[PDB]
C-alpha cells in the first residue's frame, strides 16, 4: 500500500505540515510507502498533468480574493492549479478527500476552499488545521489515513 498526498503550499505552512505528518507516520510505520506530490513544484518546472494510479489525499490552504470581490470575496485565488490537478483525467474518483489549512481570524472564510472543493467533486473534508498545524493535527490526520487506507495500527 502507498499512501498519496498531493498539495500546495505558497508560503510554508501547509509544505510544513505534509513533511512533519510524513515522519510521524514513518515513526508510526517503518516500511510504509508515502509520496509527495507538491502541484507548485509540477507548475514551475513546467511539468504536465497526469492521472494517479494510486488513491490521494489533497491538502489545500486558503486564499481567496477577499475585499469587496464577487460573491463575497469567495473566489478562490492562487490554489487553482490544485483543482486542476484534480479535474484531470480520473484523478477526482481517486481522491479520498481533501484537508484544509486556513487562519482563524478569517472567521467564516476559514478553510472555505477545501469545502468548494469538497462540494464540486463530492470527496468530504477530512479535517482542516491552523497554519502550520499542530501535534494533535498531526496524530489525527495520521489516524484517519490509516483508516482510509488500512494501515495496521
Ligand atoms: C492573501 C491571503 C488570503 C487568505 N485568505 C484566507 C481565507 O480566506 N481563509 C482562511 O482560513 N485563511 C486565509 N489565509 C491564510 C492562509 O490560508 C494560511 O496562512 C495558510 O496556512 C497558508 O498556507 P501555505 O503557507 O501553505 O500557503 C489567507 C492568506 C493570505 C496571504
Avoid: W
Amino acid at each position: 500500500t502507498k499512501v498519496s498526498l498531493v498539495y500546495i503550499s505558497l508560503s510554508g505552512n501547509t509544505e510544513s505540515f505534509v513533511r512533519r505528518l510524513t515522519d510521524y507516520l514513518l515513526e508510526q510505520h517503518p516500511s510504509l510507502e508515502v509520496e509527495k506530490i507538491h502541484i507548485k513544484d509540477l507548475v514551475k518546472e513546467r511539468q504536465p498533468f497526469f492521472e494517479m494510479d494510486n488513491p490521494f489525499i489533497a491538502f489545500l490552504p486558503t486564499y481567496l480574493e477577499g475585499g469587496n470581490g464577487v460573491d463575497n470575496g469567495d473566489v478562490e485565488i492562487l490554489t487553482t492549479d490544485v483543482g486542476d490537478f484534480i479535474a484531470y483525467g480520473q484523478n477526482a474518483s481517486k481522491c479520498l478527500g481533501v484537508i484544509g489549512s486556513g487562519n482563524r481570524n478569517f472567521n467564516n472564510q476559514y478553510c472555505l476552499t477545501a469545502k468548494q472543493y469538497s462540494e464540486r467533486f463530492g470527496f468530504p473534508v477530512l479535517a482542516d488545521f491552523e497554519m502550520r498545524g499542530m501535534l494533535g493535527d498531526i496524530k489525527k490526520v495520521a489516524g484517519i489515513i490509516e483508516e482510509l487506507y488500512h494501515i495496521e495500527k
